[PDB]
Structures are given as C-alpha cells and as structure tokens.
Design a protein around this ligand. Structure first.
Ligand SMILES: [Ca+2]
Ligand SMILES: [Ca+2]
Ligand SMILES: [Ca+2]
Lengths: 102, 396, 46, 46, 46
C-alpha cells in the first residue's frame, strides 16, 4: 500500500492450488486487504489511518501474472469487483492512493 | 548453550557424594527409581541398613537444593498402566488411535487422583525429532513454586531430575500427531497433601502439636467410650458395626457408644490433606490366608484383584484406625495389603494417639461409613513376599 | 469430540470454523461477541 | 499386520505397494482418490 | 488453590483488585496498613 508519503508491505498466506492436503483458509482480496492493514470497515467503506482505500478510491496495480489471473476470474462471477477475487498465492497487488481525489 | 552451561555449572557446585549418586543414576536409573518408589514400606533398620538408602538420600538432598521461583511447565512420557489403564492404547508400530480406546481412556481417568513418588526425568519442551517416544501417552504437567529440579547431562543431552511427592489430576486429553504417529496429550494438575512416609518423628510431632488441645474439650462419657475403644473394646465395636446392627439388632447402649465415639471425631476436622496408611488382611476383601488368591506372586492373582477392585468404591461400616507411617510394624507384619488413603481438608476425624497410653502408634481415626475409591493397585516385594499397595482416596 | 492434529493448542474444528482467544484459551467463535471487540480467526488445522 | 523396519512411520507394505498422506498420517493407496488430487508414493522400506 | 493464570505467583483477584507483598508472599490489599508503609500494587493478571 503506497499512500504517497510512506509505504506498507504485507505478506498474506494463501492456499496452494493443486494440493488436497493444504488447509489454508481461502479469503478474498478485500478481506486480505482489510486484515493486512488493520483497516476499519464502516458499512461498505474501508479506511486506513484516515484514508479511504476502497476499490474505487485507489489504483490497483499488478504484474502480468496477477493481472491475468484476476482478468480470467472476473469473467465467472457477478458483481465484477476486484475485491472479490480469491488471492491465489502469487499475486503482487499494489494499492496506490491518489494524490488528488473527489 | 546457555542451559547446557547452567546444567554443567550446577553439576559442579555440589557435594562429591551427590556427584556419586547422580553419576550412578546416569546408568542405573531403573532400580534407583524403583527403590525411591518402594523404599518407604520396610522396617526401620531395614530402611537404614539398606545399602542403596544413603545415596538415595544424597541425590534426594541434591534435588531439594535447586528450587524454582515460578511455576514451570514440563513434559514427559508415561505408560497408561500408571493411570490404571490395563490395556494397550495402540501397538508401538501402529499409527492411529481408535475412537473407542480414546473414549475408554477418557472415561477411566475422568476425575481420579493418582499419587506419585520417586525420581523422574523430565524436559522443558515437547519431544520432537530424535527424542525418545516410548509410550503413546504424553503428560504435560505444571510444577509449582519452590520445586526442586536438578539439571544434568547424560553425556549427550540434558535432562531435569525431580522427585514427585504429590498427586496428579488429569483434566483433558487430546489426540496429537507427531512425525506421523498419533499420541494422547493429557493436561495434569498438582494436588498437594501432607505426608510423613517414613520419618514418623515429624508426623507425631505435628500430630501432638495440633491435637494436644483436642481431648480437653470432651464430655466424660465420650472420653470414657473413646478410651475403652482404645483399650480392647474396639474389636467388639467393630464386629458390632459389621454385624448389621441398625437394621437387624438395635442395641441402645452400643448405639450410644458409637454415636458418642463418632461425634468425638467431628469436633476438630483434619486441617489439611493427609496421606494416611493402613495395613490390612484378606478378611476385608472376601479372602483368607489359606486362599490361593492371597499368593500375590501369581500374576493372575494380581490381575484378578485389579479387575475386581481397581476403580471401585469400598465401603467400610466400622471405624478405620489407621497409621501415618509407611514403615512395617511387627504387630501386623503378616498382612500383605496396604491401603493408602487420601484425606481431604475439613474432613471428619482425629489423631487419637495424641494422648499417651495406646497400643497403636501414630494412629488416626475417622468416621465409620466413609467410602474409599481405589484409584490404583500396584505391587512390590518385601523380601520374598509380594505385597500390594492400593492408592485410594476418601470420597466422603 | 476434541482433536489437535498440529499440536498448537487450538482444536481442529475451531481452526477450520473460527475461534477467538479469551483468558489465554481458544474458544469457539460465537457471533455475539463481535461488539465487545473480539476478532474471528481462521487457520490451518494441519 | 503393520511393521516399520526403517522406523520412519510408514509401514513396509505401504512403502513397497503404494501409499499417500492424509491428515499427517500414511494411508494405503486406493486408486479412487487419484482424481481428488492425491499422488501415489513408493519408497524403500529399508 | 487460588487462580494464577500468567504464572507469576500473584493470583488473579489480587492483581486486578490490589495486593501487597509481605514476607515475600502476595497478600490481598487491606487499606488498614497503608500507614505502616506498604504500597498498593495493581497489574494485569494475563
Ligand atoms: Ca490445532
Ligand atoms: Ca517404513
Ligand atoms: Ca498472576
């Protein structure tokens, strides 16, 4: 997470794909972001220290592999929001907080 | 390396006799531990003139030289037989533990108290790779403050040698998986109690310290029936109570007798938890000296007595005159069963031998009709005879 | 029926269904005590 | 029976005829769970 | 047997209501001996 003045790096555990004996609980990108940054959730808004880090209020940057995985997975579900993808062990998500917002 | 150097440090700043004891322990811990378990049940001269005695003392006096300042968690393996589980949980080659055997071990160690004794080697961590895992049962205990724990080195590892003088209460057991094998992990607690195993000097000292002011607050009739109970009438009172009096033969004066001797015990209860002893004969367990079952050198006899009495609740209708000394006396040297009762706090009873003039030495009396639950039955060898010790407890 | 495969003081069902910590012992997650401030944890029971 | 010569908590018959691991425990291989994702292992029992 | 959760020789009730040390043993705080020089301590029982 890159606020503009300081950054915060986090590692969040994810389940291995081809493994039946991997019992790591499976969470979404929104839940992972809420857990990794201690964000507060009022109703539908996710807040860092004083900054809204909602999916619409920031810029999500990925690498080619993560962008691919997210693109393919968005096609198979309603409510096509990136904060509902399943965080498959190798994503490289970068939230960027915009300098000017309305 | 810190604990290594600390253990090697403690093992130099101690007596040379203690070094000799501990070094003998490093190889022959088997018979040393058996002796520390079964030493208290011999004669006085038998205990003192025994060769393995003194070094025990020495190593014992080493343990008490290193007390801990806060409760410490320790782990050690234990055989299920130590907790009156007379069958196998799982073969040492098997990997899984059945639900049935688990539930059985649960229901057989639910709310019992198992008194411990002797030396024990423990560790401060859960056993992992390379550690010796002999039994499928792992005990995780919490030793309290001021508990002697001597660290030592068996030339390759570090162990903690302690001496256990308490009773264990298993609370919860769980299935664990270590390195591909299933084990049972049990949580235990310490239930301390007063004990004077062989040094009956401390015993009767505390006894006449606490119950010297006992008899001087009694009515002359109750003191009279107490002292003619002491001086021979006890046999008649016992065979009157076990003769089914209050339902078959109502005897008014003997009922007054027994109610006055019973009320003469509920005036100043036992102030703490006591470990009391009593040798007894076969006539109380439906047996006699001429029966073949009394020959406890038979494995089948020990097994049948266990199956018939272990885990049961005996009920004694008469008064149970008992002793606070594990040492063998000549007045009852022929008896082979040793009942080891645990008496809780605020219990009815009294140490009647505080007033001199009694044949029974260091003798305590408690109310008649109080049941005893037998938690464990084990055995030892006095010379050539095999005598049984019965870890029991007062169940009110 | 209680069961701790990985031996980390949290039962299997609690790890795979949700738990929290109260007085240093893991307790099963009731949805009630979310307003007291407690959080719901999930983990690998293996 | 179950016998472990090399003392690695996998029985001899499993190592020589096939096994897998389920909940940290070795189990004899049944082909039915080849499609659930489990792999078949063989190793030296000595 | 009084309850000591954190295993630091001070019971829970004493830590959360007030205690003081006398002869190297924690005793429940009585306001009677505040003028004898003793102090009232509180701490976390966890
Ligand atoms: Ca667990
Ligand atoms: Ca093998
Ligand atoms: Ca405390």
């Amino acid at each position: 997470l890159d606020t503009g003045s300081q950054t915060f790096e986090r590692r969040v555990a994810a389940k291995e794909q081809g493994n039946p004996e991997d019992k790591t609980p499976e969470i979404t990108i929104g839940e992972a972001i809420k857990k990794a940054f201690s964000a507060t959730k009022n109703g539908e808004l996710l807040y860092f220290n004083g900054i809204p880090i909602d999916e619409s209020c920031v810029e999500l940057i990925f690498d080619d592999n993560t962008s691919e995985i997210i693109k393919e997975q968005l096609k198979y579900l309603d409510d096509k929001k990136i904060y509902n993808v399943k965080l498959e062990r190798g994503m490289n998500i970068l939230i960027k907080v915009p300098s000017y917002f309305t | 390396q810190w604990e290594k150097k600390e253990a090697e440090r403690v093992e130099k700043n101690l007596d040379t006799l203690e070094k000799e004891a501990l070094e003998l322990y490093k190889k022959d811990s088997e018979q040393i531990s058996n002796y520390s378990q079964t030493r208290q049940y011999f004669y006085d001269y038998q205990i003192e003139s025994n060769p393995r005695e003194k070094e025990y003392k020495n190593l014992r006096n080493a343990i008490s030289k290193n007390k801990i300042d806060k409760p410490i968690n320790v782990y050690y393996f234990e055989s299920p037989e130590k907790f009156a589980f007379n069958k196998e949980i799982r073969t040492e080659n098997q990997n899984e533990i059945s639900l049935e055997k688990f539930n059985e071990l649960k229901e057989t160690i639910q709310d019992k108290l198992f008194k411990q004794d002797g030396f024990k080697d423990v560790s401060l961590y859960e056993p992992g790779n390379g550690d010796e895992k002999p039994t499928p049962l792992l005990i995780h205990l919490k030793l309290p403050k001021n508990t002697g724990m001597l660290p030592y080195i068996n030339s390759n590892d570090v162990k903690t040698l302690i001496e256990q003088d308490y009773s264990i209460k298993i609370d919860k057991i769980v299935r664990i998986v270590i390195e591909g094998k299933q084990y049972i992990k049990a949580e235990a607690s310490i239930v301390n109690s007063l004990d004077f195993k062989d040094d009956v000097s401390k015993g009767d000292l505390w006894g006449k310290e606490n119950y010297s002011d006992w008899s001087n607050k009694l009515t002359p009739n109750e003191l009279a029936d107490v002292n003619d109970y002491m001086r021979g009438g006890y046999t008649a009172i016992n065979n009157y109570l076990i003769s089914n009096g209050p339902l078959n033969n109502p005897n008014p004066e003997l009922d007054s007798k027994v109610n006055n001797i019973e009320n003469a015990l509920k005036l100043t209860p036992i102030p703490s938890n006591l470990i009391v002893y009593r040798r007894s004969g076969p006539q109380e367990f439906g047996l006699t000296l001429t029966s073949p079952e009394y020959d406890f050198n038979k494995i089948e006899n020990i097994d049948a007595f266990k199956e018939k009495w272990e885990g049961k609740v005996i009920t004694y209708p008469n008064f149970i005159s008992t002793s606070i000394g594990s040492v063998n006396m000549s007045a009852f040297a022929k008896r082979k069963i040793i009942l080891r009762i645990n008496i809780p706090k605020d219990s009815p009873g009294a140490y009647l031998s505080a007033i001199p003039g009694y044949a029974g030495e260091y003798e305590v009396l408690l109310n008649h009709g109080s049941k005893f639950k037998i938690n464990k039955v084990d055995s030892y060898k006095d010379g050539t005879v095999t005598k049984l010790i019965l870890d029991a407890t007062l169940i009110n | 029926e209680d069961l701790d495969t990985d031996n980390d003081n949290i039962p299997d069902a609690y790890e795979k269904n949700g738990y929290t910590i109260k007085d240093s012992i893991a307790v099963k997650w009731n949805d009630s005590f979310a307003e007291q401030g407690y959080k719901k944890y999930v983990s690998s029971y293996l």
